[PDB]
Amino acid sequence: KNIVFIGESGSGKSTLARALAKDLDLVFLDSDFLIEQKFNQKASEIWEQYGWNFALEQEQKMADFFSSCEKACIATSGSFVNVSNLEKAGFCIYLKADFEYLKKRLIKWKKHYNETLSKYEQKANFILNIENKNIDELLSEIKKVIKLEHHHHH
Amino acid sequence: SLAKNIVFIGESGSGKSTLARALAKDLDLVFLDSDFLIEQKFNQKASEIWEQYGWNFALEQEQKMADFFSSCEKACIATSGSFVNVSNLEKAGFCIYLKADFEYLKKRLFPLFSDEIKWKKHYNETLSKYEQKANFILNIENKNIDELLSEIKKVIKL
Ligand SMILES: [Cl-]
DSSP states (O other): OOEEEEOOTTSOHHHHHHHHHHHHTOEEEEHHHHHHHHHTSOHHHHHHHHOHHHHHHHHHHHHHHHHHOOSEEEEOOTTGGGSTTGGGGSEEEEEEOOHHHHHTTOOHHHHHHHHHHHHHHHHOSEEEEOTTOOHHHHHHHHHHHHHHHTTSOO | OOOOOEEEEOOTTSOHHHHHHHHHHHHTOEEEEHHHHHHHHHTSOHHHHHHHSOHHHHHHHHHHHHHHHHHOOSEEEEOOTTGGGSSSGGGGOEEEEEEOOHHHHHHTOOOSHHHHHHHHHHHHHHHHHHHHHOSEEEEOTTOOHHHHHHHHHHHHHO
């Protein structure tokens, strides 16, 4: 019983998760924030100091942590998609947009983006096309989807 | 055991945030700081929330945070100064009470005589609650972080 936002950098996961957490009265968890608070260091500095393997392990620990808790609204990192069984974090909302759209709101990245699109679509409980929508439109659509979930029945 | 988390409890000034973060790094656990989590949710200092919503809403937010701690696992948790008043706080995990006397905490910082008696009274009362709920009681007075981490690590192992 978590709401879990997944998608690529630039998709607005942090902004949406926070607002929704406040509206639905849930615990707001931001993956990058939690990692940075633990290490007292920016995420990129963590990656550079400890190596990609350590960094990925931290991402996995965050994913496992998300799968353990309840009543949270979670913004996941750009690495979440690659962890083991990421759909177990809760009800997943994929914030979908094309590469050019995401790029403007922020190479190897394109490679990552191309190969990861299918994983997001598979893990999503709900796919939300975010292009050209303001925050209130997005929140409205998400709140409807959550109400539909909690209507069946519960 | 079946304790899911390490939970630091005690008054403000007892060093819960610093020790929980340090231990989280050393034992490779998730670091959760109650006040940080509340502030990132409302984008407001935890104090300003007391003023905008009811004191009852604030206690409700503190209770929801406690529920959350009781739900998760493999975290190292710095609880707030209100945590001791929540219900079923033992469900949060292995509780470590960071103990210090009033005089000491006053150093690690109520302009009126009356306000200080009130504060001391409050302190005295919560003292028995902390020592009640603690799985390990750690006096922090005049001890540096490496000494505190060493004592905690030993206790965890046992
Ligand atoms: Cl503190």
